Short mmCIF file of C-alpha atoms in Angstrom, two decimals:
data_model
loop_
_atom_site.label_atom_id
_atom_site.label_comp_id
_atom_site.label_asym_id
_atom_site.label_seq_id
_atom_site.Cartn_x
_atom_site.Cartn_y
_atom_site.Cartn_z
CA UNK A 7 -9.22 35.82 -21.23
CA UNK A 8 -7.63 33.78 -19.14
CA UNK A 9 -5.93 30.71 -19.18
CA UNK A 10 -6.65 27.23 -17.28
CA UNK A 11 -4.06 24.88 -15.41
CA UNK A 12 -3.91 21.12 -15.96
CA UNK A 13 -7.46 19.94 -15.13
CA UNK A 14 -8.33 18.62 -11.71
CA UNK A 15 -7.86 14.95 -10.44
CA UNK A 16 -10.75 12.75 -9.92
CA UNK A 17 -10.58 9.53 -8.09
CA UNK A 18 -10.24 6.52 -9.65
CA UNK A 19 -10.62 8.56 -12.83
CA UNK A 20 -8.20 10.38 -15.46
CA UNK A 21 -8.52 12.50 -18.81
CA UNK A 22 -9.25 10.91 -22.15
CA UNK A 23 -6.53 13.32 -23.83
CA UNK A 24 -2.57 13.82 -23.61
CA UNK A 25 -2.16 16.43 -20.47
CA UNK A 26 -1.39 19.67 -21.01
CA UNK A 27 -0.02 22.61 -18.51
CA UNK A 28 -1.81 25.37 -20.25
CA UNK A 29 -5.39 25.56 -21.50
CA UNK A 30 -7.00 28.39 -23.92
CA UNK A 31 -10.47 30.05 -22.44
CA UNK A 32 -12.97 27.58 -23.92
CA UNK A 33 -11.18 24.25 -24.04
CA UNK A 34 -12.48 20.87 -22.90
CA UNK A 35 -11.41 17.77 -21.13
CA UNK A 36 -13.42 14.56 -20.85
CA UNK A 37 -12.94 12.11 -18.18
CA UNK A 38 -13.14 8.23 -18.01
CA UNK A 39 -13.80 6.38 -15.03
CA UNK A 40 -11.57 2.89 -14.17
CA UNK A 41 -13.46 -0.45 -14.75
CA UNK A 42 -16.97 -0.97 -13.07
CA UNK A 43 -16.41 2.07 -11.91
CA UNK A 44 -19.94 4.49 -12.83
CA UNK A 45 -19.08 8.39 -14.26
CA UNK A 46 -21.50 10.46 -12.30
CA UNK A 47 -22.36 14.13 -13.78
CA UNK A 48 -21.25 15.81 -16.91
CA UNK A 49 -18.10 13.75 -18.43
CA UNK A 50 -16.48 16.88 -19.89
CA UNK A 51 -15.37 19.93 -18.39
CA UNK A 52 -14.85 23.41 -19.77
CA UNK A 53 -11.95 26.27 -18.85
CA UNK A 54 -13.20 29.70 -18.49
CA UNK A 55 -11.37 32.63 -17.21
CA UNK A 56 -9.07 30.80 -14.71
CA UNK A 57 -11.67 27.58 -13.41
CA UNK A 58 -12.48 24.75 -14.85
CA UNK A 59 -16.11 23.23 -14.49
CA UNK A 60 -16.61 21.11 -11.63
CA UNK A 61 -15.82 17.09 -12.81
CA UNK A 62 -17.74 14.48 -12.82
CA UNK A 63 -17.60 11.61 -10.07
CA UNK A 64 -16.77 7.90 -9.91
CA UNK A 65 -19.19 5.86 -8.41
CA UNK A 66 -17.78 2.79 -6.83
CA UNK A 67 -18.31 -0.82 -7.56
CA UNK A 68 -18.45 -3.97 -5.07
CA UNK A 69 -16.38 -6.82 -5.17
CA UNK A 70 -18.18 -9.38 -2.94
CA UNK A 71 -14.92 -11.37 -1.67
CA UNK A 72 -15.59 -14.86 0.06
CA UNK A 73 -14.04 -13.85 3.14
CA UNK A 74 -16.88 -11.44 4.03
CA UNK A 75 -19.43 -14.25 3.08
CA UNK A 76 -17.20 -16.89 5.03
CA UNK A 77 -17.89 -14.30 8.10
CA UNK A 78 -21.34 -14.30 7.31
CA UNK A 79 -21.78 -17.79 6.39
CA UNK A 80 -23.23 -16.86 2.73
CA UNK A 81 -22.28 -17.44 -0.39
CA UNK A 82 -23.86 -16.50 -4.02
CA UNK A 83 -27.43 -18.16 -5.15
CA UNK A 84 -27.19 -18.56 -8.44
CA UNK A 85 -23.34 -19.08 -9.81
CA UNK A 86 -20.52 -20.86 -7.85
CA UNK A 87 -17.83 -18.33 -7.96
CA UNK A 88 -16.33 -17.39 -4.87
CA UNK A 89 -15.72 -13.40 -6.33
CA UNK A 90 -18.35 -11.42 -7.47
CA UNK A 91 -17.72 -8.05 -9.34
CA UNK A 92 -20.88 -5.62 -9.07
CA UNK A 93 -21.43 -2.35 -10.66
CA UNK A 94 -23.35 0.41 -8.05
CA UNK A 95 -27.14 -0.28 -8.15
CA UNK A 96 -26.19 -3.97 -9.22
CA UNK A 97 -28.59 -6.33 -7.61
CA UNK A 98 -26.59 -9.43 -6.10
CA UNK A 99 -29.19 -12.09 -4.65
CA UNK A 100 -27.36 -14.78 -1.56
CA UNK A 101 -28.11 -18.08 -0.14
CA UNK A 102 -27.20 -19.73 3.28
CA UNK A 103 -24.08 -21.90 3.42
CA UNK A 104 -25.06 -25.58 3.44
CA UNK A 105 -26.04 -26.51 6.96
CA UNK A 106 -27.06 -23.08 7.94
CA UNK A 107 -30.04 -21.02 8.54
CA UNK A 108 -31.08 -16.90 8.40
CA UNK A 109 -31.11 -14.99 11.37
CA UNK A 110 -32.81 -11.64 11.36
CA UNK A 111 -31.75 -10.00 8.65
CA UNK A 112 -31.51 -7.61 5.71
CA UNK A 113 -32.94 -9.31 2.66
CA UNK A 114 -30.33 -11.96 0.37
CA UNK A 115 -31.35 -9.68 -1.85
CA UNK A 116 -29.32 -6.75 -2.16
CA UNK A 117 -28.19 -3.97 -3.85
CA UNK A 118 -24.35 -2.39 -4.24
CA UNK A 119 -24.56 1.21 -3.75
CA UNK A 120 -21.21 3.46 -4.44
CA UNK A 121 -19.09 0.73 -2.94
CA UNK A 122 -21.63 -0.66 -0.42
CA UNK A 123 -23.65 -3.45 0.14
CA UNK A 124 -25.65 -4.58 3.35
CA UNK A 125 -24.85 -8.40 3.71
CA UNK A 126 -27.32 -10.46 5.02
CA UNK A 127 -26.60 -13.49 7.78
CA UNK A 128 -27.40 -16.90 8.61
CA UNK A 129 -26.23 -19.38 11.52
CA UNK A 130 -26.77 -22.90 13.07
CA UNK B 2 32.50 -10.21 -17.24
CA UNK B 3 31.21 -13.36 -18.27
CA UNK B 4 29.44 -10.99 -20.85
CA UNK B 5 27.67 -13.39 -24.01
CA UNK B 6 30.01 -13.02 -27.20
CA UNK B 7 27.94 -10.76 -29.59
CA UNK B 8 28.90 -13.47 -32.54
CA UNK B 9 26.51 -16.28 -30.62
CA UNK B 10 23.83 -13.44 -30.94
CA UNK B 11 24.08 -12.55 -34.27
CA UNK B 12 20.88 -13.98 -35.35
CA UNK B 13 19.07 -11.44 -32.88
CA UNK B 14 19.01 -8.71 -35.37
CA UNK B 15 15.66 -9.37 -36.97
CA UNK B 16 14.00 -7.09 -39.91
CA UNK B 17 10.14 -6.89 -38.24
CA UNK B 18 6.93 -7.12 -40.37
CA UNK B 19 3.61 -8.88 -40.17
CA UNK B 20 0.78 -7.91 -38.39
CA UNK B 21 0.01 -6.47 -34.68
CA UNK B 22 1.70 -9.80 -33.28
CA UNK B 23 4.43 -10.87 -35.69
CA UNK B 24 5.48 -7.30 -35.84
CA UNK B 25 6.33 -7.01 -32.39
CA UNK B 26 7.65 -11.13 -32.64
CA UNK B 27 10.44 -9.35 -35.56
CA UNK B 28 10.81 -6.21 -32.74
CA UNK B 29 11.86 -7.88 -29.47
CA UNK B 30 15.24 -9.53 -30.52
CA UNK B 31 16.85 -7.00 -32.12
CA UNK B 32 15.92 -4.67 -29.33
CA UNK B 33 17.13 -6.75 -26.61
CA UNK B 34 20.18 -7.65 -28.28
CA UNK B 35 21.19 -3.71 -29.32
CA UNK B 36 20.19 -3.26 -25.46
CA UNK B 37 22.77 -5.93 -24.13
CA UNK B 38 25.16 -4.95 -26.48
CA UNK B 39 25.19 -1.64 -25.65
CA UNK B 40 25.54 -2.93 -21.85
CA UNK B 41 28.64 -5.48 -22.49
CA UNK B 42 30.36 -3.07 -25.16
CA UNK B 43 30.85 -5.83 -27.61
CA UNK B 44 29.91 -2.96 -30.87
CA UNK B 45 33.27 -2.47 -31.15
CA UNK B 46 34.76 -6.17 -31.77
CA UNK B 47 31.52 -6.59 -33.36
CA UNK B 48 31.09 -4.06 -35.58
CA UNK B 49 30.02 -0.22 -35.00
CA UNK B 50 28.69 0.33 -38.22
CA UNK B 51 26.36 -2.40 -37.60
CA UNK B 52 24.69 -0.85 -34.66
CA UNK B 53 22.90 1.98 -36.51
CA UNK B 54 21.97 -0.20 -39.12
CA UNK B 55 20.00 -2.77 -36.40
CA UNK B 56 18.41 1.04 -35.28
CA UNK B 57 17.00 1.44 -38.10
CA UNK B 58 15.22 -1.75 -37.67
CA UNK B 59 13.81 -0.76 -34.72
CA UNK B 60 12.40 2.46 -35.77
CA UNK B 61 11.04 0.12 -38.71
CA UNK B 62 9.02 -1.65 -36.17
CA UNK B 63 8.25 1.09 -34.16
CA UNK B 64 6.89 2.52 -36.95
CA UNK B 65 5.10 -0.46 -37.81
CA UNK B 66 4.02 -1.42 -34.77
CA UNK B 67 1.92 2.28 -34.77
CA UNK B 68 -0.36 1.24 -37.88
CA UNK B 69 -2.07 -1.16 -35.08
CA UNK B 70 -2.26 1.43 -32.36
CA UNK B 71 -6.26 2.06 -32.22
CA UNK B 72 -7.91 5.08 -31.48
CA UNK B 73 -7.96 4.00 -28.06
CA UNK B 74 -4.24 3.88 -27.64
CA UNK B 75 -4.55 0.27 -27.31
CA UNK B 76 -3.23 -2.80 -29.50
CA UNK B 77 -4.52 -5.66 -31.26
CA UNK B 78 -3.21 -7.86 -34.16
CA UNK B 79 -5.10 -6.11 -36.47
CA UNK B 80 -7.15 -2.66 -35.77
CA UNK B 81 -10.72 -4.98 -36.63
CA UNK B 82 -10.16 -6.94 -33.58
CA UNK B 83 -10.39 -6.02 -30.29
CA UNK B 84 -7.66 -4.71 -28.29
CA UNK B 85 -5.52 -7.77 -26.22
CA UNK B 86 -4.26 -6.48 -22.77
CA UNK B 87 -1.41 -8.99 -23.06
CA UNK B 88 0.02 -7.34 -26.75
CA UNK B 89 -0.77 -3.63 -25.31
CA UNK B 90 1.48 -4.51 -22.17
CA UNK B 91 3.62 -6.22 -23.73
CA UNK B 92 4.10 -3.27 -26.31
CA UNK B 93 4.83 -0.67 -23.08
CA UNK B 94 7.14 -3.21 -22.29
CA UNK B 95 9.26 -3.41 -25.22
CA UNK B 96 8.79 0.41 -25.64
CA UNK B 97 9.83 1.38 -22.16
CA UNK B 98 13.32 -0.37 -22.64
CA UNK B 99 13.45 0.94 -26.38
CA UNK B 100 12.90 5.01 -25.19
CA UNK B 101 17.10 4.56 -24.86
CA UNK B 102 17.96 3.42 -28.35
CA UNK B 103 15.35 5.14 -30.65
CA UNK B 104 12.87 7.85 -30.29
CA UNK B 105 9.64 6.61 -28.60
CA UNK B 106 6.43 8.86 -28.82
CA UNK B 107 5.42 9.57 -24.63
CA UNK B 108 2.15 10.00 -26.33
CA UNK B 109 1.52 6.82 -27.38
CA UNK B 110 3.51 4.48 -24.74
CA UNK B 111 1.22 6.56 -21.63
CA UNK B 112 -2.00 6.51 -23.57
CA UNK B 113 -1.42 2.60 -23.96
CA UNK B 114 -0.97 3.00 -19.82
CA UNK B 115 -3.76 5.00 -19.39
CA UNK B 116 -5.79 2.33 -21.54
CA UNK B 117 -4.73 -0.29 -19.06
CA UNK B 118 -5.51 1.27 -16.18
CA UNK B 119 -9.06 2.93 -17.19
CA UNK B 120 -10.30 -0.40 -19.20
CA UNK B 121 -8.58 -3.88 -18.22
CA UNK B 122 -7.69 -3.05 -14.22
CA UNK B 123 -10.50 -4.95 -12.10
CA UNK B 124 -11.86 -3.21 -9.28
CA UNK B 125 -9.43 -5.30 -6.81
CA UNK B 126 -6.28 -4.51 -9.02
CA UNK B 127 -6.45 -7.86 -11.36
CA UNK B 128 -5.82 -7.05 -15.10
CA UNK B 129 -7.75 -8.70 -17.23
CA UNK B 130 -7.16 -10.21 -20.64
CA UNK B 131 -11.28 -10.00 -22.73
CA UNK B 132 -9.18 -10.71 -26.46
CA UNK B 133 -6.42 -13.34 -26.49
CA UNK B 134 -3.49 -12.87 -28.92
CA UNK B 135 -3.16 -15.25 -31.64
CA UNK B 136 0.21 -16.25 -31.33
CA UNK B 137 -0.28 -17.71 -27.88
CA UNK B 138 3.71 -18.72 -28.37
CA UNK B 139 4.36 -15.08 -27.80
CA UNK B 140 3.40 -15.06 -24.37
CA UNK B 141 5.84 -17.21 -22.55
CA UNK B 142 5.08 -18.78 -19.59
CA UNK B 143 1.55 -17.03 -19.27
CA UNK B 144 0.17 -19.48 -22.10
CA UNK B 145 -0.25 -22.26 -19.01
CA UNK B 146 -3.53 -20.34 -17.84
CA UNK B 147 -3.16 -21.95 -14.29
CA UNK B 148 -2.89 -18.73 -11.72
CA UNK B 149 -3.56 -16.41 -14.47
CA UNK B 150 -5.12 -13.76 -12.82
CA UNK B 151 -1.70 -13.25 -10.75
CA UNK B 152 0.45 -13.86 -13.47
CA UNK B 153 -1.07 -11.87 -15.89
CA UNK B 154 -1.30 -8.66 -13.04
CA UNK B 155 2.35 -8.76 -12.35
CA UNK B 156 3.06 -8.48 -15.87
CA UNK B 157 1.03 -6.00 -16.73
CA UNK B 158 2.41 -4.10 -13.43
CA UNK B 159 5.76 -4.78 -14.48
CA UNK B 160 4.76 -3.21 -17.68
CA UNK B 161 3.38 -0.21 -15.66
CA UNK B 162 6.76 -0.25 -13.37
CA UNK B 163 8.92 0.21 -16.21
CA UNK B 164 6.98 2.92 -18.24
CA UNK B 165 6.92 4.64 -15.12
CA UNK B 166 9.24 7.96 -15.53
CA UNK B 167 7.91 8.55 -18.63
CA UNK B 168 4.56 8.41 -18.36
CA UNK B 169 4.39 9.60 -14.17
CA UNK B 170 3.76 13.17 -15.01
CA UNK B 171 1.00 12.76 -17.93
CA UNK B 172 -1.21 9.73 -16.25
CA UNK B 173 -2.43 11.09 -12.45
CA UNK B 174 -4.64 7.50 -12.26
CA UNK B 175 -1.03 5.46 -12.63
CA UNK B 176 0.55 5.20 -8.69
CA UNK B 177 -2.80 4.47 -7.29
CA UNK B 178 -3.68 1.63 -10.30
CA UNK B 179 0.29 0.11 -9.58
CA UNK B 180 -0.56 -0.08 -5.66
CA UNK B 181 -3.76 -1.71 -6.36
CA UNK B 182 -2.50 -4.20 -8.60
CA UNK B 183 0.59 -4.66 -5.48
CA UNK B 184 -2.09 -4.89 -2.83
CA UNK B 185 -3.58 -7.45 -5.11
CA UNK B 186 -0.42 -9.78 -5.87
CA UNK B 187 0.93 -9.12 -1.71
CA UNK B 188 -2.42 -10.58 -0.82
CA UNK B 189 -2.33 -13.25 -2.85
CA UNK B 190 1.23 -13.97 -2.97
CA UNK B 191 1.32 -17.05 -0.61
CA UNK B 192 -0.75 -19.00 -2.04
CA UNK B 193 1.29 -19.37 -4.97
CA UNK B 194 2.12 -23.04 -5.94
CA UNK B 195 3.30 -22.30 -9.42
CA UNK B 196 7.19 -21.28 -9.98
CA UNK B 197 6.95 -19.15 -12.93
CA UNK B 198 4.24 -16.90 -10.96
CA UNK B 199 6.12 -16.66 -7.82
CA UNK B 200 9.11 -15.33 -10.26
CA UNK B 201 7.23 -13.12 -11.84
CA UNK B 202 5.14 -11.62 -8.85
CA UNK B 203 8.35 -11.80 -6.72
CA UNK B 204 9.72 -9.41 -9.18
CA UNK B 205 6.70 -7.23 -9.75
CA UNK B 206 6.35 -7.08 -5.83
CA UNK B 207 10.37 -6.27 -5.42
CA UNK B 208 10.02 -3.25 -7.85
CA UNK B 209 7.76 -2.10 -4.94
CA UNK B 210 9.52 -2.71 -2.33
CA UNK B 211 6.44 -5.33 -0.76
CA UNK B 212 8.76 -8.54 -1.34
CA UNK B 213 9.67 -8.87 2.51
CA UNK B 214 9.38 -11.74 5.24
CA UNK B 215 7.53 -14.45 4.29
CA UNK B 216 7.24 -13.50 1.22
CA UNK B 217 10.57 -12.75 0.37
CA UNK B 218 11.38 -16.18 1.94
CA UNK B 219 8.98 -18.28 -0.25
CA UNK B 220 10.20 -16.56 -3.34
CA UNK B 221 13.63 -17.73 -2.34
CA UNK B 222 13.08 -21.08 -1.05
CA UNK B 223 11.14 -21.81 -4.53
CA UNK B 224 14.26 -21.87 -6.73
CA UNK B 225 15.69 -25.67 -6.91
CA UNK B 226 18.89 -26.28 -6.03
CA UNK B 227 19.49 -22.02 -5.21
CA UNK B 228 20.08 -21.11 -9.05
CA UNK B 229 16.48 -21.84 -11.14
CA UNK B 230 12.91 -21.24 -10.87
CA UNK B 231 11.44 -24.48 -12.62
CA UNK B 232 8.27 -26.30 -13.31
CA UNK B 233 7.48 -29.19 -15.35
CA UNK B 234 6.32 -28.18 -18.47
CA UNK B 235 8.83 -26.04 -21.75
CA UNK B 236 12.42 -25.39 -20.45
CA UNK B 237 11.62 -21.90 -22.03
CA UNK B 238 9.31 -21.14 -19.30
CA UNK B 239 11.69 -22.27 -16.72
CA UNK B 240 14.71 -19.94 -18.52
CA UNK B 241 12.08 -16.96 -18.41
CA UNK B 242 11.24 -17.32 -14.76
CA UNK B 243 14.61 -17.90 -14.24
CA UNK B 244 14.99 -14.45 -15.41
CA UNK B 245 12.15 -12.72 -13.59
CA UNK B 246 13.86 -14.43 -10.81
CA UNK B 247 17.24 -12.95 -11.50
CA UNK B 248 15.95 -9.13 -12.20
CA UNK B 249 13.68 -9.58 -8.77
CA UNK B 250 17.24 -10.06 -6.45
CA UNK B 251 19.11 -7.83 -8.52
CA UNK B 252 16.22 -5.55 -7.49
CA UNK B 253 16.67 -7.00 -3.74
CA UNK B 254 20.29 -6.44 -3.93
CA UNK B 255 20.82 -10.14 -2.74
CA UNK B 256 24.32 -10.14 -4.92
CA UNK B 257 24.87 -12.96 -2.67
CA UNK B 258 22.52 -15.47 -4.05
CA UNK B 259 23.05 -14.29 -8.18
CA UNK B 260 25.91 -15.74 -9.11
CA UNK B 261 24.79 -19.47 -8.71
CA UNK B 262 21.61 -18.26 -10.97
CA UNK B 263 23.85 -16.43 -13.77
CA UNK B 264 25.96 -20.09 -13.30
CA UNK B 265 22.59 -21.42 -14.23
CA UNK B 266 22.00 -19.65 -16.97
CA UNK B 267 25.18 -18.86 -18.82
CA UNK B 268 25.22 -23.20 -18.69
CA UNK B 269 21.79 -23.30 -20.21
CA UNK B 270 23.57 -21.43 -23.25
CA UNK B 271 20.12 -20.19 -24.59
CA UNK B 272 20.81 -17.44 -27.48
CA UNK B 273 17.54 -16.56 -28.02
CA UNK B 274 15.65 -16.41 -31.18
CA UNK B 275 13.18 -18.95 -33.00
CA UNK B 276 9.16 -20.27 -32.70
CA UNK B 277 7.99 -19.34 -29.43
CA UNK B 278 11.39 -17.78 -28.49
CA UNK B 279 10.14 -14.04 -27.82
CA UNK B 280 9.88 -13.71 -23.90
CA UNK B 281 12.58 -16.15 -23.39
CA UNK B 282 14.65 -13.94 -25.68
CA UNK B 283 13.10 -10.44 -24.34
CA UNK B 284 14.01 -11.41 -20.77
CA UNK B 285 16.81 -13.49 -20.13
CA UNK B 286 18.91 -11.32 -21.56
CA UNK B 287 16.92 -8.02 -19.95
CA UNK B 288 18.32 -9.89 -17.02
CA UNK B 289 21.82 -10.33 -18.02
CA UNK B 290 22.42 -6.87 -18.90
CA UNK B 291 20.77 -5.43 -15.73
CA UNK B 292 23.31 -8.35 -13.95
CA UNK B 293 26.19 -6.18 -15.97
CA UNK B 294 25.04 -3.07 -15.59
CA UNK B 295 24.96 -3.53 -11.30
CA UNK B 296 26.21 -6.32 -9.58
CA UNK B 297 30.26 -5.40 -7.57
#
C-alpha cells in the first residue's frame, strides 16, 4: 500500500508525462530517450509498495567529427559530409584521405556500438 | 529614462487569430509592448483601463495558440503538419516572458521543453529544424540559412534559458541538454563570420556564463562603430542582433559599452509592428526594457 517518489533519472532520458511527487501503488511512467539515442529494456516502469521497476537504458549514438578522421587521415566513403550522426549498431564504411594509404588496421568498415566506434588508419 | 512614449507604440496592441503561425504573429506585439510598458510605467499617462483590456488579448492568444499544441506538446501551423522546432521555441519564448502578465499553463510551456530536448537536440547539442514554418518572415534573422545550425541552437537555448525556473523542477533532462547545446555554440563560436550569429550566440553563451576571453572579445570587436551588430542584408536583422547584442552585455554587466548601443537604437526609431516585423518587434524592445529594468 504504499506510495512511490518521483521516478528515477535516466541519462540522457526523461518521462513522457508531467512529474509528480507522489505516486499510487500501481502507477506507470514511460520514458523517452534524446535523439539517436536507442531505449534499451522495458520503456515503462511500475510503482509497487515503495520501488519503482528498474528503467530502461539509453544507448548512445556516434557522431563521427572530422577532427578524429583528420587524426586518422580518413574521411567518409560514400557522402562528402564532414559530420556523420550514427545510431548504436549503425554501420559507417571509410576511405583513405587522397594521397594516403592503410596501415594495419581494423576494417573501414565499422560499426558504432553504445557510443563507440574503432576507427581505422591510413598514412603515406 | 529615455523610456519610448507609449503613444509611438500604440499600434502594438494587436487582437491575435489565424492559424499556428499568424496566431502567435497577432501574440508577440501586444505582449512585448504590455511587457515594456509595465517596465517604463507609461499605463498611467497612457491609460490604465487600457492595460487589462490588451490582457485579455493575450489570454485570447494564449488560448488560441493551445488549439495547435499537439499531443506531443509540440507546435505546428496547423495540428496536420508536423511540428516546426523554430514555432515550438519560439512559443516557450513568448510564453516564458508572458508567465508575468497572464496565467501560463507550466504544463504545457515544459512539455514543449521536454519536446525539444527529447526530439530536435542532436547528439552534439545542435537543434534541429525537420518542418519549416510557413511564414519564413516570422523568423527574423534566422531566414538567411547561412550558419544555421549555430543560429538556430542559440535560439532554441535561449528559449530553454528563459523557461528555465519554471520548468527546472518538472524536466530532469533540461541542465544537461542547455550545457550541451553551450558546449556546442563555445566550440564553435570562433568561427563565426556572420554578425547576427555572433549576437545571438554571444547572448545565448553570456546567459551561461561561457562568453569570456576570446570570445567575449570577438563578440565585442564585431559591433561597427561600438553601438550595432550589422550585416548586409534587411536593416531588421541588423535592429534584432542589435538587440541580442544589447541583452548579451546587459547580461555581461558591461554598462560601459550600452549606452552608445541604446544611442543606436533609440536613433533607429523602430516602433515595431508590420510584415515581417515580429522578432524585430519581440526583441528590441525585450532589450529596452531589460536596459530599464538594470542599468545605474
Amino acid at each position: 500500500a504504499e506510495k512511490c517518489g518521483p521516478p528515477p533519472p535516466i541519462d540522457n532520458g526523461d518521462i513522457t508525462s508531467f512529474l509528480l511527487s507522489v505516486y499510487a501503488p500501481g502507477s506507470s511512467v514511460e520514458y523517452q530517450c534524446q535523439n539517436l539515442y536507442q531505449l534499451e529494456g522495458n520503456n515503462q516502469i511500475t510503482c509497487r509498495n515503495g520501488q519503482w521497476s528498474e528503467p530502461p537504458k539509453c544507448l548512445d549514438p556516434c557522431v563521427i567529427s572530422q577532427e578524429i578522421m583528420e587524426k586518422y587521415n580518413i574521411k567518409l566513403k560514400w557522402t562528402n559530409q564532414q559530420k556523420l550522426y550514427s545510431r548504436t549498431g549503425d554501420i559507417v564504411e571509410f576511405v583513405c584521405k587522397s594521397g594516403y594509404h592503410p596501415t594495419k588496421s581494423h576494417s573501414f568498415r565499422a560499426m558504432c556500438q553504445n557510443g563507440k566506434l574503432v576507427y581505422p588508419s591510413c598514412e603515406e | 529614462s529615455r523610456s519610448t512614449d507609449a503613444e509611438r507604440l500604440k499600434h502594438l496592441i494587436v487582437t491575435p487569430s489565424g492559424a499556428g503561425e499568424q496566431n502567435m504573429i497577432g501574440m508577440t506585439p501586444t505582449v512585448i509592448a504590455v511587457h515594456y510598458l509595465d517596465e517604463t510605467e507609461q499605463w498611467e499617462k497612457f491609460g490604465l483601463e487600457k492595460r487589462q483590456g490588451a490582457l485579455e488579448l493575450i489570454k485570447k492568444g494564449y488560448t488560441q495558440q493551445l488549439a495547435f499544441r499537439q499531443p506531443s506538446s509540440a507546435f505546428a501551423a496547423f495540428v496536420k503538419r508536423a511540428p516546426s522546432t523554430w514555432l515550438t521555441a519560439y512559443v516557450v519564448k513568448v510564453f516564458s516572458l508572458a508567465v508575468n502578465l497572464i496565467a501560463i499553463d507550466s504544463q504545457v510551456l515544459c512539455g514543449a521543453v521536454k519536446w525539444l530536448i527529447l526530439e530536435k537536440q542532436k547528439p552534439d547539442g545542435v537543434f534541429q529544424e525537420d518542418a519549416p514554418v510557413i511564414h519564413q518572415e516570422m523568423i527574423g534573422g534566422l531566414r538567411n540559412n547561412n550558419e544555421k545550425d549555430m543560429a538556430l541552437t542559440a535560439f532554441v537555448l535561449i528559449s530553454l534559458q528563459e523557461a528555465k525556473d519554471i520548468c527546472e523542477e518538472q524536466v530532469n533532462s533540461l541542465p544537461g541538454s542547455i550545457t550541451k547545446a553551450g558546449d556546442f555554440l563555445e566550440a564553435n563560436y570562433m568561427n563565426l563570420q556572420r554578425s547576427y550569429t555572433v549576437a545571438i550566440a554571444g547572448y545565448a553563451l553570456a546567459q551561461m556564463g561561457r562568453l569570456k576571453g576570446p570570445l567575449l572579445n570577438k563578440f565585442l570587436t564585431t559591433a561597427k562603430d561600438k553601438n550595432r551588430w550589422e550585416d548586409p542584408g534587411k536593416q531588421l536583422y541588423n535592429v534584432e542582433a542589435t538587440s541580442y547584442a544589447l541583452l548579451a552585455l546587459l547580461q555581461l554587466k558591461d554598462f560601459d559599452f550600452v549606452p552608445p548601443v541604446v544611442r543606436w537604437l533609440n536613433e533607429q526609431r523602430y516602433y515595431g509592428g508590420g510584415y515581417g516585423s515580429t522578432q524585430a518587434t519581440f526583441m528590441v524592445f525585450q532589450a529596452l526594457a531589460q536596459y530599464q529594468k538594470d542599468a545605474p
